[PDB]
């Protein structure tokens, strides 16, 4: 019966909503991941020219 | 001579069968200055590969017109008799002059333009002309001479 199709329209809107919802929370945690890997690498890096430098330096002396 | 100490500590003669060496000549600097100059080569291990000779303010004029000629003898000795790359930085050529202008006076001449000796450039040219390949061509010595404007 017509009506229980509305019914049947709604709960299907409220997932495509709640399918969108949850296919940003992903977009959110790859963004993020993709950042700390980044913000880590760089990092990692300049340890290594901070170190390059203080032994060489060391050497020297 | 921010850019002068930057070259001393940096320059080299990347893949060269030959070794490189400075040869950092400052005339009359401060005694802050030169306190400076000595603590840069000594903490960046610069001075491995340097002859540092330093030459204050109020050491005698005759001993700052000298100063040249010992950095070009020793650049000349380590490029010739070693086979090295030397790189000679001489700062600053202006204050050379201005003690060389200082004896022309002492020393009876007629004064050329803007009170300076009459033999500036032939003087000039006696540590200009040192420079280039040294025979052998395993070494070379260049210059990299500072020379501030008096008055801009």
């Known amino acids: 019966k017509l009506e229980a199709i509305l019914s049947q329209e709604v709960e299907a809107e409220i997932q495509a909503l709640l399918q969108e919802a949850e296919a940003k ?19 990692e890096r300049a340890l290594e020219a901070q170190y390059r430098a203080a032994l060489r330096r060391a050497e020297s002396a | 001579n921010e850019i002068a100490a930057q070259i001393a500590r940096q320059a080299t003669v990347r893949p060269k069968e030959e070794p490189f060496a400075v040869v ?17 080569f000594e903490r960046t291990g610069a001075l491995s590969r ?34 090295y790359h030397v790189l000679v930085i001489l700062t600053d050529m202006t204050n050379y002059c201005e003690a060389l202008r200082e004896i022309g006076a002492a020393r009876e001449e007629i004064p050329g ?23 052998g061509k395993k070494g070379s010595v260049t210059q990299i001479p500072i020379l501030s404007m008096p008055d801009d």
Do not use: C, W
């Open chain 2, 113 to 135: 333009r803007r009170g300076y000796p009459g033999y500036m450039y032939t003087d000039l040219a006696t540590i200009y002309e040192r420079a280039g390949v040294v025979e």
């Open chain 1, 25 to 43: 929370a992903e977009a959110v945690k790859r963004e993020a991941e993709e950042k700390a890997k980044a913000l880590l690498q760089a990092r």
């Open chain 2, 50 to 83: 340097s002859v540092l000779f330093l030459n204050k303010a109020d050491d005698p004029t005759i001993e700052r017109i000298l100063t040249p000629r010992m950095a070009l003898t020793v650049a000349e000795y380590l490029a010739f008799e070693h086979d």
């Open chain 2, 24 to 40: 950092f000549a400052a005339m009359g600097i401060t005694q802050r200055e030169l306190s400076y100059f000595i603590q840069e």
